[PDB]
Amino acid sequence: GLMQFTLPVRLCKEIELFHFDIGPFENMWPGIFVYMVHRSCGTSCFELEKLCRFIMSVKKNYRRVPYHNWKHAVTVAHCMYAILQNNHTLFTDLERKGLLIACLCHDLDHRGFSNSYLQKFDHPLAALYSTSTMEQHHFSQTVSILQLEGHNIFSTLSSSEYEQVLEIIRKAIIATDLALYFGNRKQLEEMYQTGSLNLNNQSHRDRVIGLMMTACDLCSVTKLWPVTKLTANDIYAEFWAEGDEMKKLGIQPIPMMDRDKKDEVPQGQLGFYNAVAIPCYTTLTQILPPTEPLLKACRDNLSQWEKVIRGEE
Ligand SMILES: CCCCOc1cnc(N)nc1OCC
Ligand SMILES: [Mg+2]
Ligand SMILES: [Zn+2]
């Protein structure tokens, strides 16, 4: 019970910052997550025995893919930690329990292919789940690991509280489907502008939670330029793999997934920062002002991509 996780001085300080990078030491990632849970939620939220077992079954069910891997899981969970920590009084007990677990679990058993390629390949999962294919699968994988004997980290919640947290985790994971974000953020932009936004309205909380999930999921664009740049290599490694497989289906992929069209990548990132990232963190900073550091980091990285195109790097 009195067993606290303590990090080295540089991590203990840097971890509280939005732009924290969890480092190349995989065996430190569990303790970093448990440390974030203990300070976000409490030393009591979970039986340390069951959480540790949970964490390690979750790790085992991520694959060895260039981007959608165990590192991505802990990285997305860390972004949520900083949002939660900078917004102490806005989220309930069950939300702070749910959302970190939601983030660690959000890409379980990812193969490195989009919902598009699953449908064109005619993968079994595309017949099981017609929309948000991989995200319904990710949520299914979370339930199954929660159901392994000794793994139920919520065991100590009432029937209602348990369904409340599963519900938060399900919507949280489904919201990571980027196809759903555009309408989520538009709706949120309207509600905030017309003043109709109300955090006592569950429908409204759901939408704000969805946007937080998108913000955390995309958080590689809110790191320092060297992390953002080296992570982009992992992202495009998956995209080029998927384009290769599209070509094997006899379909010419979109230039973003064509490894012949690598020159178009810098311009590819401008479109993405302007179309997806900046809007996402703009509305987030409007609804939760203390998350402004993410928009600032995103704007700087937009500048760094501009400077790449202009041949300055
Ligand atoms: C397919 C997953 C959706 C996340 O897509 C991205 C995330 N972060 C960056 N820097 N670029 C992305 O695509 C840009 C072409
Ligand atoms: Mg995903
Ligand atoms: Zn993800």
Catalytic machinery residues: 68
Examine residue 162 and state whether it is found in any structural domain, yes or no.
yes
The number of beta carbons lying within 10 Å of the beta carbon of residue 139 is 24
- Name the token pair of 90: 């806005």
Q: How far apart are CA 11 and CA 221, in angstroms?
A: 21
Examine residue 243 and state whether it is found in any structural domain, yes or no.
yes
218 touches ligand 1 (CB under 6 Å) = yes
* Residue 129 exposed, middle or buried by CB count within 10 Å (0-12, 13-18, 19+): middle
The number of beta carbons lying within 10 Å of the beta carbon of residue 85 is 16
Examine residue 9 and state whether it is found in any structural domain, yes or no.
no
Structural domain boundaries enclosing 111: 28-310
Examine residue 12 and state whether it is found in any structural domain, yes or no.
no
Examine residue 266 and state whether it is found in any structural domain, yes or no.
yes
> What technique was this entry resolved by?
X-ray
220 touches ligand 1 (CB under 6 Å) = yes
Nearest CA to ligand 1 atom 13: 272
Which CATH number do you get for residue 87? 1.10.1300.10
* Residue 9 exposed, middle or buried by CB count within 10 Å (0-12, 13-18, 19+): exposed
Examine residue 1 and state whether it is found in any structural domain, yes or no.
no
Residues in the 5 Å CB sphere of ion ligand 2: 107, 176
Cited resolution, angstroms: 2.2
For 131, 178, 209, 264, 296, the CA distances from 205, given in Å and listed in that order, are 23, 18, 6, 38, 24
Nearest CA to ligand 1 atom 7: 218
Examine residue 15 and state whether it is found in any structural domain, yes or no.
no
Number of domains in the chain: 1
Examine residue 18 and state whether it is found in any structural domain, yes or no.
no
